């Protein structure tokens, strides 16, 4: 059951794909690889076909390719990007060179939505709900996205949302304890991101649009107050604690003064997401039970994920061993039902 492939050259890139993928139109390149928009004649969907660039040129890249394929193959949730297909033209491991990934082609991200209409409070509830729904699932497999932001959130005409682009304007949504490497971060780094996204959808302004890391950190600390003793004790870097102790202390602001005219339940949830100490931020699963989502919360329709074995991260392997493991993941892929 190996498909028929056809080979063509678009840009300076060669594409060898099964003939089910028609009218390949290049949509750009980068470190993530070349991407073409295409038509999937088997499912009738428009898809993105992503060809990885140099997936096995180093130990580092070969392991990175394996990590990506394992992760994408595990994500099965209606609010998270899923893998429609993965393929190689190679008929054997010894021919194995190229990896292609296929996803549903996403027609608009959250920024494109905001540029075409004014969102209602109900739109915001549903968008944020779906982010938190997806995160509960991601976090339940001990995955941290690390890079939530509006450009990584796809939205369709029915206002249905999907989390895209798992990690490994760029800093504005990032938690302060990883923007400056204060500590080993938990998954509530993503909850901070959701807070920044939510505040921006409500006010129409970026919450913390700092230029450099320091300028940004001061805007954050102006809203949420400077770290107290309990948080300082959790910061590993002696230099970080010394920098923090040099700052003039600042109390937390009253958010109702910052977000005047927003649904008080929305403001209340933001207060629970944008807490400086990550150990006290609301989790995705708790946040779904917040009164703000009462129209959408359904405890029996907020699934968790299967356990995700990441013990490969501590394996020290040869470049061709990472390449062989990736090949197994390619040949063992089962497509989703439809």
């Amino acid at each position: 059951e190996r498909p028929t492939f056809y080979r063509q050259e678009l840009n300076k890139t060669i594409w060898e794909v099964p003939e089910r993928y028609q009218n390949l139109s290049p949509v750009g390149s980068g470190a993530y690889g070349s991407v073409c928009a295409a038509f999937d004649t088997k499912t009738g969907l428009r898809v993105a076909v992503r060809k990885l660039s140099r997936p096995f040129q180093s130990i580092i890249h070969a392991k990175r390719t394996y990590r990506e394929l394992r992760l994408l193959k595990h994500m099965k949730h209606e609010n998270v990007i899923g893998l429609l297909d993965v393929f190689t033209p190679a008929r054997s491991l010894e021919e194995f060179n190229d990896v292609y990934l296929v996803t549903h082609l996403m027609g608009a991200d959250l920024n494109n939505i905001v540029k075409c209409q004014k969102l209602t409070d109900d739109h915001v509830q549903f968008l944020i709900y779906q982010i938190l729904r997806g995160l509960k699932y991601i976090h339940s497999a001990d995955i941290i996205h690390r890079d939530l932001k509006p450009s990584n959130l796809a939205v369709n005409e029915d206002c249905e949302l999907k989390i895209l682009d798992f990690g490994l304007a760029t800093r504005w949504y990032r938690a302060p304890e990883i923007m400056l490497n204060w500590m080993h971060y938990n998954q509530t780094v993503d909850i901070w991101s959701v807070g920044c996204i939510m505040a921006e959808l409500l006010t129409g302004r970026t919450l913390f649009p700092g230029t450099d890391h320091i300028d940004q950190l001061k805007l954050i600390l102006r809203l949420v107050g400077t770290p107290g003793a309990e948080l300082l004790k959790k910061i590993s870097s002696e230099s970080a604690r010394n920098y923090i102790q040099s700052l003039t202390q600042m109390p937390k602001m009253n958010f109702a003064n910052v977000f005047i005219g927003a649904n008080p339940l929305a403001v209340d949830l933001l207060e629970k997401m944008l807490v400086l100490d990550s150990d006290k931020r609301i989790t995705a699963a708790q946040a779904l039970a917040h009164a703000y989502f009462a129209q959408y919360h359904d405890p029996d329709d907020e699934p968790v994920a299967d356990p995700y074995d990441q013990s490969f991260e501590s394996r020290d392997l040869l470049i061709d061993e990472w390449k062989s493991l990736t090949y197994d993941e390619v040949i063992s892929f089962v497509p989703p039902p439809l």
Partner: peptide, 8 residues
């Protein structure tokens, strides 16, 4: 969500 969001 019933009425259609606008797409660019």
């Amino acid at each position: 969500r019933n009425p259609g969001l606008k797409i660019p």
